[PDB]
Structure formats: structure tokens, C-alpha cells
Homo-oligomer: A and B are copies of this chain.
């Protein structure tokens, strides 16, 4: 249980809210995002010094298939990486850059591996799997009186809690919390869909860190 550090003192808590007008939508081929944003300032969710350490991370989401993909009936398997960048750069990376996958394998993410040229830059500290299946029927319409359907796993609940990891970041001068302000140790959340199966997400996450330095 105790893989953290701050004991007697509590830890600061930053939250992320994805819902309503802001919802993660995953097109075929994956999507990249940075969960580590910390503004600098007085507020409790902000940071203080230029150096931070993250300890625990918690994830809660609700996945649901897209009406476009509800047309076909097929199964699939998705993947969620958690990736740690040592040497960030101005450009925001895309999954095509992190994993080098010949275009014929675009359909199936679960077979991807981290590209070899970058082997000392990016490293994956966690990996998870999940699977969805659609019978070819949306959930908004009424069955006929003749027959029924068992819709197993039309939408799923996905939650993980991991205390093991640790990360050390160093921030530039600027008070901003964007991607351009991080000198080292970024962190990324990568989602990739199954074969030809798009979906969306709803939920929220939390991080636990403690400013340190100067």
C-alpha cells in the first residue's frame, strides 16, 4: 500500500474533467494527450517550485461505441498505454511517431511495439487491455414484439489505480502549465481503438504529487 512518500503531510491533488462539450473522441489510429499539466501560482491545484514528483494516479471512465461504428457488427480490442518522455520537444508527438508501425498494421494496435530508434527516449511504464463488441444495433430503438436481444458489452466501465510509478519533472521559467513549458520528464496517455471501431469516453482522473526544490 505505501509506495508513496508524503506520509504525515497530505499530497496535492490535480484533477482533470472530461465530459460534456469536452469528451475524448478516438478516431482510427489513436490520439495523444498530456495529463501532467500544472499551472504555477497560489492555488492548491497549482505548483510552487520548478520541480515536482508524481506518485499515484487513478482513472475512471465510461466507454461507449459510436453510432457510425454501430452500423457493422464486429468485435475488437483496444489498448491504453501510459508513456514517459525523457526529452520533450516543441512539436506535440503523434502515435505514428512514438510507435513505428507499417501501415498494414494500422488496424490492430495490440501488436505495436515501441520504435527501436527511439528506444532511449520513450518508455512505457504501464499497459492495459480492453475489448468491446457491437451487435449492429443502437440502443435508442425499440425491438419488435417478436424477438429480443442480449447486448453483452455494448459499453464498459474501466478503472485502474496504480501507486508504483514515479516521475521527476523540471519546469522552465514561464508560469504557464502547457506542453512548451516542460524541460524534462513529460507524461502521456495514449488511447488506440480496435479494428475499425471508434468510440468516445466520459469520466475524470486524479494525480497525486508534491512540489519540491529551491
Point out residues on A near B: beta carbons under 8 Å: 9-10, 12-13, 17, 19-20, 40-44, 48, 50, 60-62, 71-75, 77, 87, 102, 104-105, 108, 110-111, 113, 116-117, 120, 133, 135-137, 139-140, 142-144, 146-155, 157, 159, 170, 172-173, 175, 183-184, 202-204, 206, 210-211, 213-214
Contact = CB atoms under 8 A, between A and B. Distances in A.
A75 B155 contact: yes
B136 A150 contact: no
Contacts of A102: 17, 19-20
Nearest to A45: B173
A57 B138 CA distance: 41
A145 to B, nearest CB: 9
A147 B150 contact: no
Contacts of A9: 213-214
A124 to B, nearest CB: 14
Dominant secondary structure of chain A at its interface with chain B: loop
A142 B72 contact: yes
Given A17-B102, A142-B72, A155-B75, A60 B110 contact: yes
A214 B152 CA distance: 46
A138 to B, nearest CB: 10
A139 B152 CA distance: 18
Contact of A111 (B60, B71, B77): B60
Given A172-B117, A183-B120, A73 B204 contact: no
Contacts of A204: 111, 113
A143 B136 contact: yes
Contacts of A137: 143, 148
Contacts of A41: 42
